[PDB]
Amino acid sequence: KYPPSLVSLIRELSRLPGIGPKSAQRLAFHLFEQPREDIERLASALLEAKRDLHVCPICFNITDAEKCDVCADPSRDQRTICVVEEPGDVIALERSGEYRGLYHVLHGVLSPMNGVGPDKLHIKPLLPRVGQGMEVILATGTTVEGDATALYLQRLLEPLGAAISRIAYGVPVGGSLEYTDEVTLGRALTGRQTVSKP
Amino acid sequence: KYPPSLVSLIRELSRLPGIGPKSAQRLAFHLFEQPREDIERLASALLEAKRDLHVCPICFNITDAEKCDVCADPSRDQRTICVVEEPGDVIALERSGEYRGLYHVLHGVLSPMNGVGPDKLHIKPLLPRVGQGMEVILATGTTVEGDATALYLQRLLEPLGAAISRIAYGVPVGGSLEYTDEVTLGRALTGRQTVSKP
Amino acid sequence: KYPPSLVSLIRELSRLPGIGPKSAQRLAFHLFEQPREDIERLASALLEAKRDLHVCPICFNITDAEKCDVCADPSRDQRTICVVEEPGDVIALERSGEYRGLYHVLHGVLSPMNGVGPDKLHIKPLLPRVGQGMEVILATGTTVEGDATALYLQRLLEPLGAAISRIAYGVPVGGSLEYTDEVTLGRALTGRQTVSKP
Amino acid sequence: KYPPSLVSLIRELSRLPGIGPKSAQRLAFHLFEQPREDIERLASALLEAKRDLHVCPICFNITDAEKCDVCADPSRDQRTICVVEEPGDVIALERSGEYRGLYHVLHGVLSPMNGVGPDKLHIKPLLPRVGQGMEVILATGTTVEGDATALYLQRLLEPLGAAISRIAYGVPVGGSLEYTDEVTLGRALTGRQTVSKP
Amino acid sequence: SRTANRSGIVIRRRVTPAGDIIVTLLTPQGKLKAIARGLSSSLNLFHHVGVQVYQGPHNDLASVKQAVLEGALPTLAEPERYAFAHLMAEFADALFQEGEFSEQAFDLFAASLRGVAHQPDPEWVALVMSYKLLGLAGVIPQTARCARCGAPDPEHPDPLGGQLLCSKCAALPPYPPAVLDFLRHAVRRTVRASFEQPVPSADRPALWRALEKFVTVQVGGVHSWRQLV
Amino acid sequence: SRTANRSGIVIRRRVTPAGDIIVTLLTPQGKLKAIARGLSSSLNLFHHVGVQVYQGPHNDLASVKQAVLEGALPTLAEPERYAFAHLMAEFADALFQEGEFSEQAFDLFAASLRGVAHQPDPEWVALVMSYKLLGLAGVIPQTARCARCGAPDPEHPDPLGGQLLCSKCAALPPYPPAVLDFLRHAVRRTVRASFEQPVPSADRPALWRALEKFVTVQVGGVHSWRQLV
Ligand SMILES: [Zn+2]
Ligand SMILES: [Zn+2]
Ligand SMILES: [Zn+2]
Ligand SMILES: [Zn+2]
Ligand SMILES: [Zn+2]
Ligand SMILES: [Zn+2]
């Protein structure tokens, strides 16, 4: 590799997740075939974003305003807060067409191992948002990390007068028990819902 | 070269699921390197099983007796019936270490390329097994097929006096929301379990 | 449940290459749905083959006779011997519609987890088959194993008066340089064929 | 999706090859977690490149100078020209450690179907570069496109006094005949190299 | 390139003995078989899905490298409604011989699935969409002239060819006017227009039967979607 | 994340009946089994390779989604030299019990393969690197004291434990000084330093034998790499 500009692009691109050396090069030689209007629009989009994009002060969902669109929106159920690990989960639980409440983003998951505690995550700004006649849905992951963060959150929010809930551990949609993990099945079972009471 | 013998083995092995032409050949040339005691034990084992194995008359779980080991076993909770699509699910829900009840096997999934219907599936022999003070757990798949079969079963079993339940649609064990399907999340959410009331 | 019969089939099927536990079970429950005429024909076919099939005494290609069909066949070019690692390669190079010579099967690839060596491979019975006015095409793999076996074979056969050749290292058919390994390209290049002299 | 900045990034990223909607979002939420020094360096790298990067006037290999590093370099065999479809092939055939000659980049492949002819590809600027006592290695793909472009190039370059060669069609390194395409094998065979002449 | 991004609807799924998932997709550029070795089990029937497929060395079967869930219909988990996409999916797959197949056929197929998902009468949707699909396949029943002698405006069933016979060629009584009207104009007029003019459930079996006879006589195959009716 | 990029050397390959490619890799973060369903057949022995692996729901076997060819050694296609990476790869895999394994062990292993690739005496490289690897595994032969009674500076073979016995505990004659010197200082001193001081091919079998005895007595396993000697 010689032209430093190409060596420079491969590097920066390869610094991105899900894109190795071989794929970065594959990518640099595609950018070469493109017309300058796009490269600029890609660059600008990146920058516009890096500048315009900031974390919401209330919940910490990503936006470019004073409050996130969720916080602003008045038709949104102002009584339920869905705590989540990452802003991407907000989209996931949003494009899920079954939740119109408020969200809250701990920008990560707890992990005692790496001294990462409820001070490296936006857990503080959540407390004041929680009151009575409200529900706090805990939608953190299901790794020992998500499981741990949630139980920590449960403990913390307890003293405030809200209903705390955790999303359902269970078999995913479109699967058969045979290929479902053991611990999942045991949870899908113990957490079984009654569809009819005699 | 044309030994109907090698050509014949490749065919029959390849007539098997999960095993394409390339893999069948790979398999025939491995059987060649094997001693005779094994080939016989593979062939006898085959013949055999086909003989000793038949469907259970009560539930239709696979066995070689009058009643399946589940039906026979007296320590098994005689009051819960877990309806399933395939005998393999019985193993899956058995090696799951959380269920000691009775099973029932509709041999398939409602409708696939044609009307497998409640007459092409062992739905009839189930009705008489269902009584009051009993529970019918619906553990059919989660495809539109499993979802449909279950609701059909629910309707049918309703008039009998048993509690009907469906396994929990939900996130699988060992996953993070980011890679979880949208419809799953919405179900894991709406089906959330309360871990603590205030 | 514990029928050594189902548990026994899963095991033996799973003792087969390319077929894991989950797939073995998937397979046992399919054999269950099958009639008896087939199971028998699968078992007999097995027993059988194991019986009729043995290694050819001349070349060691698989057969059920005194000589392999290749050795027998009189229309086959009796002057070229294609050395190969496995009997499956004979089919591959046979269904290739471009070779009517004789084959020779070293049963494996030089060294894998231990010294398969020229005494663990049918290299001896090849020497006497090689004479002058003959060609020995080396069609062993291209792993360091195939590469090594071939060079060993080249050395060995040298003293006999035959032309020794190796198959062409090169780009595979239906590919573009972009997705072709580096070492392949360098070989496809250094081994370039002249399509026209000036 | 609401913040137009996020919707805008997903779009532009998703406009890139090998990166679908789901992956673009995955990517936007990763860029969010990053410190501004990188976003800028990515943006700049893109732009620097879009500005500094141009096609070489001699051969059309990508660079930022008057002549490509290959053209400039004096230790490079000035007598061999390797015609290629894309600048990425130059890297591939460069990181191949077996070629120190000059390259030439038709920025594509011929295709009679789409009126794409030797006027949409840098075929003209090649002619003047070809003289006698020189070799033109045709390293275009092996699709009907690469095969066709090459034969066209062969025809064209013929009248000039150079040796024309095509890279070797053949089995790729690290494969066994069994999984090698039929047409490849037939080429690896007809194009066999003699390793020893009696 | 040579991985590609494709979007479409899952019309069939296999879970093999090995544990793979082979799926057929109907796509705007439609006709796609692919396999996802082994997470990506949101590739369930009737899910609209985006996939990254690598074809590779002419393998007869492309392979999945990422799958999205672009749009599902949970309503389709219901029994009566569900019984109208199988036939829809199995019908479409049989009807189109594999070259065939734009974007028009795909939009109509997707529409038929929203139809059977959200609409009170899934059977009527399935009937209308099936005959409508006959147009986009270029297999249109001749309805203007008796199938045997050519006489204009035949009113009677055609047991041998699925079309219509005149009273002289017919041995069976005339179709009811609602059935005739549908047969004559359904392929040509709007899907909206036909939803607005249902046919009594009593007269529908005659409509299904004509479709079956027509399609088995005109298109080759072992029309297994009839288990679908 | 939860796909990951990993780089390492292919030490084993299977091509299964199905047509998959299961490979074991030695990596700086080392110990990696993975499978590439079905293009990516540059995953051959001793190729240095970059891979994108998706683990997934605790599947015992990660899966390949892209493989690069970062660095090969075509020289290793030669017979004598080749006979010194199998033993190197098979030796390393046996020696390390699976928790174990930094980056030091990996650099040394990679070095051993360049060694057997480019150097006149591949056997000597393989000997030196094998004993050197014993250090990075924390299985160092005690050489200062007789293995039986403790006496300083033993010179004699130890048939039972691979170490050294004094003259009172020994039933066999003393090792030759070149062998003793190697045994005493090889694990500790530089690889460069040892390449500069070879041992006569005549005395090498004694060196191999001690390594075999030592390693089978100290590390569990069915040390199949001895077919490698
Ligand atoms: Zn907000
Ligand atoms: Zn039973
Ligand atoms: Zn023979
Ligand atoms: Zn240049
Ligand atoms: Zn008529
Ligand atoms: Zn002693």
Coordinates of C-alpha atoms in Angstrom, one line a residue, chain A residues 177 185 188-196, chain B residues 77 79-85 89 93 98-106 126 129-131 134-141 146 149-151 153-154 157 162-168:
Chain A
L177 CA -38.1 -25.6 22.0
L185 CA -36.9 -22.6 28.6
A188 CA -40.4 -19.3 29.7
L189 CA -41.8 -22.1 31.8
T190 CA -41.7 -20.6 35.4
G191 CA -42.9 -17.4 33.8
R192 CA -45.8 -19.1 32.0
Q193 CA -48.9 -17.0 31.6
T194 CA -52.3 -18.4 32.3
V195 CA -54.6 -18.2 29.2
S196 CA -57.7 -19.4 31.0
Chain B
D77 CA -47.7 -35.2 37.5
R79 CA -52.6 -33.5 36.0
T80 CA -50.8 -31.5 33.4
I81 CA -50.7 -32.2 29.6
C82 CA -48.2 -30.4 27.5
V83 CA -49.3 -30.4 23.9
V84 CA -46.5 -30.4 21.4
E85 CA -45.9 -30.5 17.6
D89 CA -40.0 -31.3 21.5
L93 CA -38.9 -29.9 27.1
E98 CA -38.4 -28.2 34.7
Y99 CA -41.4 -30.4 33.7
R100 CA -42.6 -33.7 35.1
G101 CA -46.1 -33.8 33.5
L102 CA -47.7 -35.7 30.7
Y103 CA -47.1 -34.8 27.0
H104 CA -49.3 -35.0 23.9
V105 CA -48.0 -35.1 20.3
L106 CA -50.0 -33.6 17.4
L126 CA -56.3 -35.4 23.3
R129 CA -57.5 -37.0 28.1
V130 CA -58.5 -33.5 29.2
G131 CA -60.6 -33.1 32.3
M134 CA -56.1 -30.3 35.0
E135 CA -53.9 -27.9 32.9
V136 CA -53.2 -28.0 29.2
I137 CA -50.0 -26.2 28.4
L138 CA -49.9 -25.3 24.7
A139 CA -46.3 -25.7 23.6
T140 CA -46.7 -25.6 19.8
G141 CA -44.2 -23.6 17.8
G146 CA -47.8 -23.0 15.9
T149 CA -52.6 -24.6 16.0
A150 CA -52.5 -23.4 19.6
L151 CA -55.4 -21.0 19.3
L153 CA -56.5 -26.1 20.5
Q154 CA -57.5 -23.4 23.0
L157 CA -60.3 -27.6 24.8
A162 CA -59.2 -27.5 32.3
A163 CA -56.9 -24.6 32.7
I164 CA -55.3 -23.8 29.3
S165 CA -52.0 -22.1 29.1
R166 CA -49.5 -21.2 26.3
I167 CA -45.7 -21.1 26.8
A168 CA -44.1 -17.6 27.1

